Amino acid sequence: AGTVVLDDVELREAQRDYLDFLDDEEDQGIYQSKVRELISDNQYRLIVNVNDLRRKNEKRANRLLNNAFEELVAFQRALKDFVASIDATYAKQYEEFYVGLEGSFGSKHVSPRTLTSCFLSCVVCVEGIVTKCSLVRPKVVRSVHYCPATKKTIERRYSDLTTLVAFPSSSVYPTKDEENNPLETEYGLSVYKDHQTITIQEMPEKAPAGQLPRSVDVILDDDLVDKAKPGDRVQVVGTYRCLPGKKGGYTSGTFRTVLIACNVKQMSIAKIKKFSKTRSKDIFDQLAKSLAPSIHGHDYVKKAILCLLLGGVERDLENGSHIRGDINILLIGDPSVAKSQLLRYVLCTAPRAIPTTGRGSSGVGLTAAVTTDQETGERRLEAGAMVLADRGVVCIDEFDKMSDMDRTAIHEVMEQGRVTIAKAGIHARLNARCSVLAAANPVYGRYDQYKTPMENIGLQDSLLSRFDLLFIMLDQMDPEQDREISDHVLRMHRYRAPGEQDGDAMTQIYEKHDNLLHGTKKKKEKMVSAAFMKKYIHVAKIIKPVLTQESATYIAEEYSRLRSQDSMSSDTARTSPVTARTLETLIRLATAHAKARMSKTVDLQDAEEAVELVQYAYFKK
């Protein structure tokens, strides 16, 4: 086609507007460093805040939201121009670059249930869960052929979705020469791009109760191929378009609507160094004390939860042997001792946390399963709760109600951290390294003091050895303790959020002091802010300490001392048996304490703290 366009006021003006938008010379803009980062990382697309564009140029934002394709084309042209300007050499590699979108879209923030034809041809944002995914497939863009008879090579260009409507003249694969000499395809010189299709469903938590769900279909291009997986909660921003049906005579008048993604999102130094170096022991002291103001007392359980948050060190050797580094805890107590509050707080704070109660999930939904795909006849693996929580936390409330077979299944995860799966036609070893919290009621409803803990717990020695720590909590009815508990509870109850009028319906390292949440006496001390706590926890989890020679003999001698004291402990009973796992638990707790205070080696104080914890947990009066 020889038709060309000479002038177009709108397109030229829009391109000029984007050129001025992405200059960042007389402004505090950052996009220049973003482009330099893209050049450094060999990536070929940019993400631009919609709110930023609206602030700088409201008319362009309005036009882009109301009309997508032409404005996106102008964006891509402007990106090509500026990439050529900054570094023309890098722009040679890729044909055209792409634009992502970000920011608060406002009215266009639309649920899969509320997508309508009113938003067609516009850019929309949607939040959902992923249910179906397809295999990655290549697609031809540029084809190259060679003719052995005449020693000539030719090239053909393809453009199918670049243009809105395609015709039979295009998309034809050449096979013969002008004189019927055969052509040989040369796959090395051709160009291909990847293609994938996914399906998104409205989350069951958001859908109205008792109603069937509604879903949308998404196409993922070459860059965003591997960014999504089934069973995942995502947010997708992209165009909403109609699908051209293939040629025919009579049409019913109903198109197919498909969302074409442009952005896919998985929804989620000096201060730290100074604080750590100055505090050392006070680091873990305050972190244990400031774990959760909403919960009263129970310092040992807070210490244990902090040890889970920091964790041990995974180790590997020459022979391929694996040594576990995770910690596991079981709490048993009387009703209303706030075990479930602790579980919920750990769910909120931990990065990868999944709650799975006793009978809520069975043995199949915990680890994994194998299903025969009807579409192809092959065998596929579906991951369970524990496989999804790799290097994460699984919380199990009402642990006693869980059946025996489920606990035998959990043995594989608790011992080695791997899951072996096999059915005729497929077999695999999946990684499931994880940590477990569990809370179980006593068998008699309330913990009996006179009976030994073995009768009350009612669990076999193997399962007890599987757990690193056992804790027993009691509701002692001391008048002064009850007074303290009532004071704390009513102080929390009377508190109201600042900035909210009374009677209405419904970052510094240390938190600001509060008259009610802290109290007048506590003015001499402060609590650590949640955000800094999370940052410090992440940094500590990164750090890799090493064990010293001073503490190894000390810990070994104390383990031997405990195994000999087994005969000496005559006035009290033992909660858990002492096996070879106890020594690994000692080393693990020592390393966790060494993680608490940023350093390079494990010292004696960490071993002493670990041993104090072990002595407290393993024996009771």
Partner: protein
């Protein structure tokens, strides 16, 4: 007939308490739970309806 205290308890059940989220992310229940144990024919089901 009778059960003025029971009726007042039902009324304050209907009005209900106030729920309170907390800065730690923990929540506390703002609703009331009642139990009625009794002999047959004590007019319990009618109150529930």
């Amino acid at each position: 007939f009778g059960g003025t205290d029971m009726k007042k308890a039902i009324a304050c059940l209907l009005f209900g308490g106030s729920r309170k989220r907390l800065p730690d992310g923990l929540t506390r229940r703002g609703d009331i739970n009642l139990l009625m144990l009794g002999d047959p024919g004590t007019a319990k089901s009618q109150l529930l309806k």
